[PDB]
């Protein structure tokens, strides 16, 4: 869309309606009469626009009111209320902007932030922007977390997040303006290449693909229409449902052949009985002929009964011969109708093998996109975040996505090599205990009014705990941590000295030999300037391959690629790197997924802050002290960068409302 509605959309908001968030802060307005709502909205969308039109400079309340026209700049408190709400909730002046009003001399409140992820950094910038005093603690020796970007010489390749899943409503759109990421569209065209090394032909490719997509809509039908969501007191997975569907699809193929042959045999039984009828007519006729012969051999002159005998038998015979001719006509029909049938049989099979393996690749691609075996996705919910998908082509960061955390990191008090071991949060404030990753005898204590925790779900799930909560997290929280899924997927980076692949193709698939190994090296991206090929391990494979030497893995790749392009064309690689995310102790996996047995709800539970009980008993209810952000906290944009980035924006808003109060609500 265009103009002010463009901004509402590009900010993930309905242009013609106030959101629940807005209702909460402007209850006067939304309980109020329609007219004021439209004003409020326009003022909102308009302000958004202005920010969006130029996100490299802070948008001030002044600049905003300045640019509004009447009737709308008549209410200059409303304008401020709105402008201030947007600023708080990071819908404007987020990311990296030129500050017009240099920072408040003196800072209010102290926050310790765990993890220099994107979620961490985006929060920390805001809070700093809001005057708070913020320090980030990061176990690693660099920012970004799961935004990791390999660099040697001109080689540059992302071992974590590399795609920008569309700019229509994506905050990263804004950030790309504020930071030079070299965004290159990805050409979706991906040719597959069987186990052997031979391209799959168009005909198959499309037959199979369409079956894939058909199979999915199928699963949906089971789930919503047939309510196939529990089975033997356990929640149904996408995988289960897919098998079931495939089963039924086979069962039908057979069921049809059956009723086809049942028609053959039944038509044979027609033909048989007619042949007996015909062979016995043969008999009577042959004989009746004799008698006519004999009667006719008696010579005239005959008396009449003997004359009659001839004529009688003559007719009786022509009669039967007629009957036989008729049946020979009928026979000719059943005989040819019998030939139509064994000429036109139903489908031999549901899917060959060669296809059912190609189909297995369409599954690896799904397991790769969800970082998990489809045995583990919720049937009902794996795709709940679908409605919120952005618009536009997907893109890559061509100079490496790390450019972003690094940008965000700029100006922040980040402590690297600092691994939190314990988080204590009391009615009167919190202390965080950390150690130096390098020498762990060295201990640090950090006191603060609030803690924002961006620890990965993997890290939260860890048993025994890498991080201790004192007091323990309430069971409502810890269950959501079990219930949720934290998946895995790895990348192998192949740096070469020359391009031996098709440069007009960005990505291309390899089809695995088995179902159980459709993960291994099933896809290759060619996305960077330098001659680099990137190979994904998805599915049940990523898990296992983590236990295999790099050399082996790189071997297996060259294999695959030699098979595709010929042994003379596949040099050794100059440089290779291989991720092992599940092993990585500051990640313990790759990204969240909607486990079977979980719901989008759990993601909301993840974002609910924790409020310590009272110090002295009988003392009144405290403030919330412990806060959660990160990719697993954000129901509608989980497992992404933008979604983390947003979760971070969210918690900064919420923490400032808490500790700096919120003037805009009256």
């Amino acid at each position: 869309p265009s103009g002010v509605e463009g901004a509402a959309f590009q900010s993930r908001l309905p242009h013609d309606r106030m959101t629940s968030q807005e209702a909460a802060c402007f209850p006067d307005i939304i309980s109020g009469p329609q007219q004021t709502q439209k004003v409020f909205l326009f003022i909102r969308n308009r302000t958004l626009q202005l920010w969006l039109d130029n996100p490299k400079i802070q948008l001030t309340f002044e600049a905003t009111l300045q640019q509004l026209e009447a009737p709308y700049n008549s209410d200059t408190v409303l304008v401020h209320r709105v402008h201030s709400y947007l600023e708080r909730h990071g819908l404007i002046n987020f990311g990296i902007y030129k500050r017009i009003k240099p920072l408040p001399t003196k800072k209010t409140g102290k926050v310790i932030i765990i993890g220099s992820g994107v979620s961490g950094l985006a929060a920390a910038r805001q809070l700093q922007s809001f005057g708070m005093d913020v320090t980030l603690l990061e176990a690693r020796d660099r920012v970004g977390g799961r935004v990791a970007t390999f660099r040697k010489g001109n080689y540059v390749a992302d071992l974590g997040a590399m795609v920008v899943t569309g700019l229509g409503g994506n905050p990263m759109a804004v950030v790309s303006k504020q930071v030079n990421m070299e965004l290159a569209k990805i050409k979706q065209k991906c040719p597959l290449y069987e186990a052997n090394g031979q391209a799959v032909p168009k005909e198959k490719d499309e037959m199979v693909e369409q079956e894939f997509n058909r199979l999915l809509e199928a699963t949906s039908y089971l789930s919503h229409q047939l309510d196939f969501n529990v089975l033997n007191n356990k929640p149904v997975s996408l995988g289960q449902a897919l098998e079931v569907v495939i089963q039924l699809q086979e069962k039908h193929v057979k069921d049809e052949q059956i009723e086809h042959w049942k028609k053959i045999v039944k038509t044979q039984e027609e033909l048989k009985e007619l042949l007996n009828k015909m062979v016995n007519l043969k008999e009577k006729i042959k004989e009746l002929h004799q008698q006519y012969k004999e009667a006719s051999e008696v010579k005239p002159p005959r008396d009449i009964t003997a004359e009659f005998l001839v004529k009688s038998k003559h007719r009786d015979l022509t009669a039967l011969c007629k009957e036989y001719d008729e049946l020979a006509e009928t026979q000719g029909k059943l005989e040819e109708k019998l030939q139509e049938l064994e000429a036109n049989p139903p489908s031999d099979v549901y899917l060959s093998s060669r296809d059912r393996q190609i189909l297995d690749w369409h599954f690896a691609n799904l397991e790769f996109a969800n970082a998990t075996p489809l045995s583990t996705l919720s049937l009902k919910h794996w795709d709940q975040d679908d409605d919120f998908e952005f618009t536009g082509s997907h893109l890559t960061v061509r100079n490496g996505y790390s450019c972003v955390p690094v940008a965000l990191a700029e100006g922040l008090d980040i402590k690297l090599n600092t691994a939190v071991r314990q988080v204590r949060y009391t009615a009167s404030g919190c202390e965080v205990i950390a150690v130096n990753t390098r020498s762990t005898s060295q201990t640090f204590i950090y006191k603060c009014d609030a803690v924002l925790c961006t620890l990965p779900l993997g890290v939260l799930k860890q048993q025994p705990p890498a991080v201790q909560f004192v007091p323990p997290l309430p069971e409502w929280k810890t269950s959501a941590v079990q219930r949720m899924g934290f998946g895995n997927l790895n990348k192998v980076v192949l740096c070469f000295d020359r391009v031996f692949w098709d440069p007009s193709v960005n990505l291309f698939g390899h089809v695995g030999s088995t179902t159980a190994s459709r993960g291994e090296l099933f896809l290759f991206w060619n996305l960077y300037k330098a001659p680099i090929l990137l190979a994904l391990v998805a599915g049940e494979a990523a898990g296992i391959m983590e236990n295999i030497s790099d050399d082996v893995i790189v071997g297996r790749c060259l294999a695959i690629l030699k098979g595709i392009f010929g042994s003379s064309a596949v040099p050794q690689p100059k440089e290779t790197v291989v991720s092992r995310w599940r092993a990585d102790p500051w990640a313990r996996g790759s990204y969240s997924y909607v486990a079977a047995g979980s719901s989008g709800n759990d993601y909301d539970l993840m974002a609910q802050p924790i409020t310590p009980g009272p110090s002295i008993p009988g003392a009144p209810q405290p403030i919330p002290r412990l806060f959660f952000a990160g990719e697993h906290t954000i129901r509608n944009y989980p497992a992404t960068v933008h979604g983390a980035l947003l979760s971070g924006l969210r918690e900064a808003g919420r923490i400032a409302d808490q500790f700096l109060g919120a003037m805009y609500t009256l």
């Binding site: 039924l248 059956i258 009449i304």
Partner: protein, 133 residues
């Protein structure tokens, strides 16, 4: 709303396949057995039908009597009357057959004859006789 076209799934079939871990294989084997058991069964009746086709070799051409194409003529000679009376004894009221025997009489003049002479040839007695058979 409805499964994509050519995808087939029923409450009963889904329930059916799910019941047990193996119910899937079980069900699909019966269908596989039951197929071969009809494929063989077609194999038989092929041979069997081919056997009886060997028995009808030649056809019935060698048994086709010569045809008589003699014109109608409604003048009843005495023997034609006699042929008729005998027909009744052999055919009952099948006046078509009877006319076929007589050779030059349509199917009516036969009914005619039937009711003209029905008294003088006792064609009622002749029918009662044919009947008791």
């Amino acid at each position: 709303c409805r499964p994509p076209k050519g995808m087939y799934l029923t409450q009963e079939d889904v329930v059916a396949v799910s019941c047990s871990p193996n119910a899937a294989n079980t069900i699909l084997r019966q269908l596989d057995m039951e197929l071969i058991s009809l494929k063989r069964q077609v194999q038989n009746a092929k041979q069997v039908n081919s056997a009886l086709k060997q028995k009808m070799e030649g056809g019935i051409e060698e048994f086709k009597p010569p045809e008589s194409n003699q014109k109608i003529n409604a003048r009843w000679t005495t023997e034609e009357q006699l042929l008729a009376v005998q027909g009744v004894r052999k055919y009952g009221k099948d006046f078509q057959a009877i006319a076929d025997v007589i050779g030059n009489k349509t199917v009516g003049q036969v009914k005619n004859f039937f009711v003209n002479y029905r008294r003088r040839f006792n064609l009622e007695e002749v029918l009662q006789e044919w009947e008791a058979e």
